[PDB]
Amino acid sequence: GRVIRNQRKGAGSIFTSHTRLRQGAAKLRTLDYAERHGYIRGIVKQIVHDSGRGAPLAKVVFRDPYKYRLREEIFIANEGVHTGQFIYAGKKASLNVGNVLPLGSVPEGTIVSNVEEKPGDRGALARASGNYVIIIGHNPDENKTRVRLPSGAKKVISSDARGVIGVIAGGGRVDKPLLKAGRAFHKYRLKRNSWPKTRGVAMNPVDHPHGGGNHQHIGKASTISRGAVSGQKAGLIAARRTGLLRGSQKTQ
């Protein structure tokens, strides 16, 4: 039969990200000479909504060390940072909400955000609204630092990898019921074309592994193997358990 929906997604025709209104990509400062020997100061000049994103952006501007001009950056605003605030960035920066520092220079327990996966990658970890990473240890020989990501995962990255002190703004966005179809409508209208969702169990066999039959039903385990092939992977991929989760979760 036909190419199913989740395969058509990849050719990104009607499926590319709706991008027109976006502020620009959020990114730490390029890791230059200032930030890795000293600190450099900026002013947050505006904190601002970014369509499709949930957390507001901070627009923060710095002087240029090598040329007379301003260079502006787009940060993701940590909660509590504000317009006119001075933002300090560098190895020898001080430990306050809003500043950006290398995880090597912060005590364990430090609560950071937008952290780099490798030094210089201008930020990758915990950027969504409300999210953060905790520093839970250091290993000064072979300078690594060990952190706990929002997913629960613990991971060890370079101590020069940078992050910004505090948590990302907009927390609890998801506490509030969407209430109606229409609010989801406008939600995804500014993201990508993933809404609404026909159940494969409502299609015909041409369309889906789940399609067809004189009652609606999956007709075979919907836990599909990792090694399955395109066209096959619909449902609980690689599922190592299944069913209502009883009892406390949380990584021991």
Partner RNA sequence: GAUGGGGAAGCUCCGUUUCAAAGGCCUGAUUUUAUGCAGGCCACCAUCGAAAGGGAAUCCGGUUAAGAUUCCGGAACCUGGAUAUGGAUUCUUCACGGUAACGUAACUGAAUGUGGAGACGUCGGCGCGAGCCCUGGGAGGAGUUAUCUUUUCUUCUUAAC
Partner RNA sequence: GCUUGUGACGGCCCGUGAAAAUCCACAGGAAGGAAUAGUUUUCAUGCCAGGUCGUACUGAUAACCGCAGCAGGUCUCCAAG
Partner RNA sequence: UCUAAGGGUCGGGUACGAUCAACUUAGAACUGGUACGGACAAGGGGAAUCUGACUGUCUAAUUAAAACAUAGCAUUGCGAUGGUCAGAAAGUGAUGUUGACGCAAU
Distance of closest approach, residue 177 Cβ to RNA, in angstroms: 4
Of 80, 205, 213, 219, which lies in the binding site for another protein, with binding defined by CB under 8 A?
Answer: 80
C-alpha 217/C-alpha 233 separation (Å) is 17
Residue with Cβ nearer RNA (36 or 191): 191
What residue type is assigned to position 20 of the chain? R
End-to-end, the C-alpha distance of the chain in Å comes to 46
| 122-147 burial: b if 16+ Cβ within 10 Å, else e | bbebbbebbbbbbbeebeeeeebbbb
Region 84-113 residues binding another protein, contact defined as CB under 8 A: 84, 94-97, 106-107, 109-111
Binding region for RNA (CB under 7 A) out of 33-41, 82-90, 96-104, 197-205: 197-205
Helix (H) or strand (E) holding 189: helix 181-189
C-alpha 131/C-alpha 157 separation (Å) is 18
Region 136-155 residues binding RNA, contact defined as CB under 7 A: 149-151, 153, 155
According to the binding rule CB under 5 A, does residue 216 interact with Mg ion? Answer: yes
Binding region for Mg ion (CB under 5 A) out of 32-40, 91-99, 108-116, 195-203: 195-203
Region 34-53 residues binding another protein, contact defined as CB under 8 A: 46-49
How is residue 2 annotated by DSSP?
Answer: P
Angstrom CA distances, 37 to 40, 66, 76, 234, stand at 10, 16, 24, 51
- Out of Mg ion, another protein, RNA, none, what residue 213 binds, judged by CB under 5 to 8 A for its kind, is Mg ion
Count of alpha carbons within 13 angstroms of residue 181, beta-carbon side: 3
Binding region for Mg ion (CB under 5 A) out of 59-67, 159-167, 173-181, 213-221: 213-221
Q: Are 129 and 86 in contact (CB under 8 A)?
A: no
- Out of Mg ion, another protein, RNA, none, what residue 83 binds, judged by CB under 5 to 8 A for its kind, is another protein
C-alpha 33/C-alpha 159 separation (Å) is 17
Region 126-145 residues binding another protein, contact defined as CB under 8 A: 129-130, 132
Distance of closest approach, residue 193 Cβ to Mg ion, in angstroms: 5
- Structure-block tokens of residue 50: 């970014």
Count interface residues toward RNA (CB under 7 A): 100
C-alpha 218/C-alpha 22 separation (Å) is 40
Contact footprint for Mg ion (CB under 5 A): 16, 197, 199, 205, 209, 212-213, 216-217, 219
Enumerate binding residues for another protein (CB under 8 A): 46-49, 54-56, 58, 77-84, 94-97, 106-107, 109-111, 129-130, 132, 165-167, 169-173, 175-177, 179-180
